From Swiss-Prot, chain A:
This is Mediator of RNA polymerase II transcription subunit 14. The gene is MED14. A motif (LXXLL motif 1) lies at residues 20-24. It is found in: Nucleus. It comes from the Eukaryota. Interacts with GATA1. Component of the Mediator complex, which is composed of MED1, MED4, MED6, MED7, MED8, MED9, MED10, MED11, MED12, MED13, MED13L, MED14, MED15, MED16, MED17, MED18, MED19, MED20, MED21, MED22, MED23, MED24, MED25, MED26, MED27, MED29, MED30, MED31, CCNC, CDK8 and CDC2L6/CDK11. The MED12, MED13, CCNC and CDK8 subunits form a distinct module termed the CDK8 module. Mediator containing the CDK8 module is less active than Mediator lacking this module in supporting transcriptional activation. Belongs to the Mediator complex subunit 14 family. The chain holds residues 50 to 146 of 1454 of the full protein.
From Swiss-Prot, chain B:
Component of the Mediator complex, a coactivator involved in the regulated transcription of nearly all RNA polymerase II-dependent genes. Mediator functions as a bridge to convey information from gene-specific regulatory proteins to the basal RNA polymerase II transcription machinery. Mediator is recruited to promoters by direct interactions with regulatory proteins and serves as a scaffold for the assembly of a functional pre-initiation complex with RNA polymerase II and the general transcription factors. Component of the Mediator complex, which is composed of MED1, MED4, MED6, MED7, MED8, MED9, MED10, MED11, MED12, MED13, MED13L, MED14, MED15, MED16, MED17, MED18, MED19, MED20, MED21, MED22, MED23, MED24, MED25, MED26, MED27, MED29, MED30, MED31, CCNC, CDK8 and CDC2L6/CDK11. The MED12, MED13, CCNC and CDK8 subunits form a distinct module termed the CDK8 module. Mediator containing the CDK8 module is less active than Mediator lacking this module in supporting transcriptional activation. It comes from the Eukaryota. Belongs to the Mediator complex subunit 26 family. This is Mediator of RNA polymerase II transcription subunit 26. It comes from Homo sapiens (Human). The modification Phosphoserine is found at residue 32. It is found in: Nucleus.
Swiss-Prot record, chain C:
GO terms for cellular component: core mediator complex; mediator complex; nucleoplasm; nucleus; ubiquitin ligase complex. The keyword Nucleus applies. Keywords: Activator, Nucleus, Transcription, Transcription regulation. Belongs to the Mediator complex subunit 21 family. It is found in: Nucleus. GO terms for biological process: blastocyst development; positive regulation of transcription by RNA polymerase II; positive regulation of transcription elongation by RNA polymerase II; positive regulation of transcription initiation by RNA polymerase II; protein ubiquitination; regulation of transcription by RNA polymerase II; RNA polymerase II preinitiation complex assembly; somatic stem cell population maintenance. Interacts with PPARG. Component of the Mediator complex, which is composed of MED1, MED4, MED6, MED7, MED8, MED9, MED10, MED11, MED12, MED13, MED13L, MED14, MED15, MED16, MED17, MED18, MED19, MED20, MED21, MED22, MED23, MED24, MED25, MED26, MED27, MED29, MED30, MED31, CCNC, CDK8 and CDC2L6/CDK11. The MED12, MED13, CCNC and CDK8 subunits form a distinct module termed the CDK8 module. Mediator containing the CDK8 module is less active than Mediator lacking this module in supporting transcriptional activation. It comes from Homo sapiens. The chain holds residues 1 to 96 of 144 of the full protein. This is Mediator of RNA polymerase II transcription subunit 21. The keyword GTP-binding does not apply. One of its GO terms (molecular function) is DNA-directed RNA polymerase activity. Its main location: nucleus.
UniProtKB/Swiss-Prot annotation, chain E:
It is found in: Nucleus. The chain holds residues 63 to 159 of 244 of the full protein. Belongs to the Mediator complex subunit 19 family. It comes from the Eukaryota. The gene is MED19. This is Mediator of RNA polymerase II transcription subunit 19. The lineage of its organism: Eukaryota, Metazoa, Chordata, Craniata, Vertebrata. Component of the Mediator complex, a coactivator involved in the regulated transcription of nearly all RNA polymerase II-dependent genes. Mediator functions as a bridge to convey information from gene-specific regulatory proteins to the basal RNA polymerase II transcription machinery. Mediator is recruited to promoters by direct interactions with regulatory proteins and serves as a scaffold for the assembly of a functional preinitiation complex with RNA polymerase II and the general transcription factors. Coiled coil: none annotated. Component of the Mediator complex, which is composed of MED1, MED4, MED6, MED7, MED8, MED9, MED10, MED11, MED12, MED13, MED13L, MED14, MED15, MED16, MED17, MED18, MED19, MED20, MED21, MED22, MED23, MED24, MED25, MED26, MED27, MED29, MED30, MED31, CCNC, CDK8 and CDC2L6/CDK11. The MED12, MED13, CCNC and CDK8 subunits form a distinct module termed the CDK8 module. Mediator containing the CDK8 module is less active than Mediator lacking this module in supporting transcriptional activation. It comes from Homo sapiens (Human).
Length: 97, 97, 84, 122, 75
């Protein structure tokens, strides 16, 4: 899923840069430098959060195993409650009649 | 169903024990190979009817006991199968009127 | 009502109810783990109650009538009682 | 892997570009924008490399990144919830063990011969 | 003799929830390690609105031409 997010991030970055380059000659150049460094801050934040993602990409498989563990233990808890539930449905419904 | 709490669990305890309840148990009765219509097949006689009317027959006319006390079907038996103060009270088997 | 038989029926139903209550208590509530004391007290009390119910059911079973007094012994006694 | 170092060089070039365009540079500073466009092209090559890599990531990573922490904290929390569920389940099974032991003790008290035959059969 | 409807109990210790699931699942050393990357990445860069828009795009999911059309003056 990170490939799709990487492509979409690169696309949105290139498109916003295209809009910035289109307004670059249009904008007043002195304040346009300020708008350029604001856009550079935008791109730096996008890229550093992608850097955090590709850092965590080593730690992805352990979280996959943790999700497996959590699903398994939730299943066994539902087994305990289902056993108690079916015993209650025995003791209060079928034996009374 | 969702939650059981000290007071509610103790309510369950007293309700279940008041529904349910040195040995003082009934004298054990063995298996009976002579039964009158199917097993032994006695042609209708007279000793059996006189025993069922007048004498003590511990499988037919009553429930006998340790400490000797005889109880026929219309009486209620007080016993203590545990080593506690709580007494089992077998209700009468017939309850005439 | 008010028979040894209805007492035995209610005792057997109380046994089934104590089964469902014992599992539903001792699975829903417990101390977490280590790789509480009220729960241990609950377990002891539930085990004692189940044992007492079993003993009571056994005593009531001993109390009812035997497999002597078949229906023909009842019927012939009924006939003699009609004559007398 | 390589996408990390490529995007890191891209981010450092973006920072140097912001520094240079922050300055009143009389010389050519269009090289900064050209290097930014070339970094976008190399990021497209890295997107081809991400089609090669095929990483699947849950959303709570994105959200904890939005909170600005480490995603290592999310790893710690997933590990902690795994141990929490394992602790709870082992505890429930341990109480069932103690309850079975108590029940066979009390039934062996009240019914000797039957629990004797049960301990024989197991 | 035999009680009514006795049967065979399952295999003595199969997979349960009473085992140590993590040590069986080879995840022990990661936990023993583990028990900001904004700060660990600000080891590389300066610091860590439109970054809210970065996170919102995260929650939502011609280079020579740009350099040629990037005409803007210095002062």
């Amino acid at each position: 899923r990170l490939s799709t997010l990487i492509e979409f991030l690169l696309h949105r970055a290139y498109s916003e840069l295209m809009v910035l380059t289109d307004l670059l000659p249009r904008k007043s150049d002195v304040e346009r430098k300020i708008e350029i460094v604001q856009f550079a801050s935008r791109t730096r934040q996008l890229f550093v959060r992608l850097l955090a993602l590709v850092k965590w990409a080593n730690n992805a498989g352990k979280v996959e195993k943790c999700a497996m563990i959590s699903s398994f233990l939730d299943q066994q808890a539902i087994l305990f409650v289902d056993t108690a539930d079916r015993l209650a449905s025995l003791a209060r419904d079928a034996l009374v009649h | 169903l969702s939650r059981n709490e000290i007071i509610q669990s103790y309510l369950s305890r007293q309700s279940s024990l008041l529904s349910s309840s040195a040995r003082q148990l009934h004298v054990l009765v063995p298996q009976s190979p002579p039964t009158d219509l199917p097993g032994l097949t006695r042609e209708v006689t007279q000793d059996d009817l006189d025993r069922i009317q007048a004498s003590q027959w511990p499988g037919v006319n009553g429930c006998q006991d340790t400490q000797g006390n005889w109880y026929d079907w219309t009486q209620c038996i007080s016993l203590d199968p545990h080593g506690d103060d709580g007494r089992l009270n077998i209700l009468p088997y017939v309850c005439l009127d | 009502m008010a028979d040894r038989l209805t007492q035995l029926q209610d005792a057997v139903n109380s046994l089934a109810d104590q089964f469902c209550n014992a599992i539903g208590v001792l699975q829903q509530c417990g101390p977490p783990a280590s790789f509480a004391n009220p729960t241990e007290e609950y377990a002891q009390l539930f085990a004692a109650l189940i044992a007492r119910t079993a003993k009571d059911i056994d005593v009531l079973i001993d109390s009812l009538p035997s497999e002597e007094s078949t229906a023909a012994l009842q019927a012939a006694s009924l006939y003699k009682l009609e004559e007398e | 892997h390589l996408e990390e170092h490529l995007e890191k060089f891209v981010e450092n070039i973006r920072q140097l570009g912001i520094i240079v365009s922050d300055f009143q540079p009389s010389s050519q500073a269009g090289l900064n924008q050209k290097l930014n466009f070339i970094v976008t092209g190399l990021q497209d090559i890295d997107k081809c490399r991400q089609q090669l890599h095929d990483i699947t990531v849950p959303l709570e990573v994105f959200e904890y990144i939005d909170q600005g922490r480490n995603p290592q904290l999310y790893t710690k929390e997933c590990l902690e919830r795994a141990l929490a569920k394992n602790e709870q389940v082992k505890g429930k099974i341990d109480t069932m063990k103690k309850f079975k032991s108590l029940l066979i003790q009390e039934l062996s008290k009240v019914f000797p011969e039957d629990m004797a035959k049960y301990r024989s059969i197991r | 003799g035999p009680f009514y409807l006795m049967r065979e109990l399952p295999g003595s210790t199969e997979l349960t929830g009473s085992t140590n699931l993590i040590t069986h699942y080879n995840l022990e050393q990661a936990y023993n390690k583990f028990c900001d990357l904004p700060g660990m990445i600000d080891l590389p860069g300066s610091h860590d609105l439109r970054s809210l828009i970065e996170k919102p795009p995260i929650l939502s999911s011609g280079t020579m031409l740009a350099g040629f059309r990037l005409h803007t003056g210095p002062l």
